[PDB]
Amino acid sequence: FRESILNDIRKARNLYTGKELAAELARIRQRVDNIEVLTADIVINLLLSYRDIQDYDSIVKLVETLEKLPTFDLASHHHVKFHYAFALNRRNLPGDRAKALDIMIPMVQQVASDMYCLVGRIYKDMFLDSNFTDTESRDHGASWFKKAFESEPTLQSGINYAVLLLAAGHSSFELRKVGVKLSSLLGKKGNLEKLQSYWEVGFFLGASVLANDHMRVIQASEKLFKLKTPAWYLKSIVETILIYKHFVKPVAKQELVDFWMDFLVEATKTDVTVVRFPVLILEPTKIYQPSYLSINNEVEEKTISIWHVLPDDKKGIHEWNFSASSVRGVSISKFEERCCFLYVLHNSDDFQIYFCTELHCKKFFEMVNTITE
Known part of the structure; x- marks a missing residue:
């Protein structure tokens, strides 16, 4: 019965997208909402399937119902809480982002980069969604990405850190310092031709944007297109690029860089x-x-x-x-x-x-x- 639900969610994620996937998940939910015991494996794969169609409201409502179900211990399921906070941050009804931070900050305060980076993204999003007026959220976002970057250097935390320093007015180091470390991380990852996962290509793109590397931006943008990158993910890359473009102070390939920035930003429009x-x-x-x-x-x-x-x-x-x-x-x-x-x-x-x-x-x-x- 458990195994049946899991197998059908996986088949659903493979066969369907869009409205067609939402129908299938609602059919699977009837069963899920009557199960003898509702385990975390089912919950997680439900939340991933809703994320595939950016149905953050369903994610939030499911996780809230588990918090009231006395025998599911939500506190002990850190990955479920991660996805819950992620969904709260994207849903962004009054109090959603406050609740996400109240979930995430105590979980962090060994902590993995993704956890530091989600908190940083909530602040980043508050900054962007305030029309760049919330400079405190900008600075808090910078600090969280900084901690991630110094705790476990990755392109993701590094590019987001740099972008928020750029927005704060950074002729400067940490900014050229973050730049050196970003260049050796890019060296570690190697040639774009060998990076096949969309998430590697997306962060390669971002560091290439920060580097002002035109040919790599054009190449990595196209690769992101061919890979059928999930919307949830492309969203976060795009946000990083919008902030960069707003704050950064022709080259014969500028036209193709403009096209690809326009293509990838248009791709996040619903x-x-x-x-x-x-x-x-x-x-x-x-x-x-x-x-x-x-x-x-x-x-x-x-x-x-x-x-x-x-x-x-x-x-x-x-x-x-x-x-x-x-x-x-x-x-x-x-x-x-x-x-x-x-x-x-x-x-x-x-x-x-x-x-x-x-x-x-x-x-x-x-x-x-x-x-x-």
């Missing part, structure tokens, strides 16, 4: 509101080509505009403008839900267009069906 989409056109060479696309309110006939950002090969055609009557149609890829096929007249090939999220692709699909109907 409400799609954009005049234009940063996209990757998959070429028959099997290279993803950074591009922009827009659906234009043009007089007489609506149009689709598509253009390459900084193509390596500057020769040939890198811009298209299609009138509504020029479009045969659109089809979402049967294999890649981020991808929409666009079919146009007098073009024997197609455009295989890859968006930053599934929803962005679906919006494009719907808008093109509207102009062709």
Whole structure:
């Protein structure tokens, strides 16, 4: 019965994403909410499955019900408390972040980097979410990431520490000191081609951003795209980059750095509101080509505009403008839900267009069906 629930959660996380996953978890919950004894293995894998669709409200409500269930000892389950605080911090209703800190700070005060870094992230988020006015939260966040960094140096704590020093007005060391240590950690990790886990690539990206290393940023951003990085994770990297970009005081590849920053920030949006989409056109060479696309309110006939950002090969055609009557149609890829096929007249090939999220692709699909109907 336990094993059945566990096996079905794992199968659920593999088969489904989005709404389809939420349906499956609610089906599994009926069983979970009637189980003879509710163990921590079930709880943990439930919380991971809800995190896959950023359902922080379900995580909080489940963990609160375990706190009242007298025979579950929440205090003893530090990883469950970690995920609870994580969810409270992302949900951020009145008092959520206060409660997260009241959970996390006593757990820390041997403590692992992730625990120090979550507390640091709560402060970081308070700082960002205050429109950069909460300078006390900034300084508290810096101190927590600093402790992590000195206790167990990692790129994650190091980049977050540096970014908050940058926001505090750091011509300076710790800042160049954190910089030296970041460079030897990057040395330890080795070439980007051998880093396969999304979490290694994400922290490589961040330190590459801090280093102002353009080619690595572009390379690591693309790798983060190909790896189907979870939204929960990309969120935290993006937050770090937004703070960096706000506070840091052309290079011929600036255009591709701007594209990738725009792509990865757009990828954390759940409400799609954009005049234009940063996209990757998959070429028959099997290279993803950074591009922009827009659906234009043009007089007489609506149009689709598509253009390459900084193509390596500057020769040939890198811009298209299609009138509504020029479009045969659109089809979402049967294999890649981020991808929409666009079919146009007098073009024997197609455009295989890859968006930053599934929803962005679906919006494009719907808008093109509207102009062709």
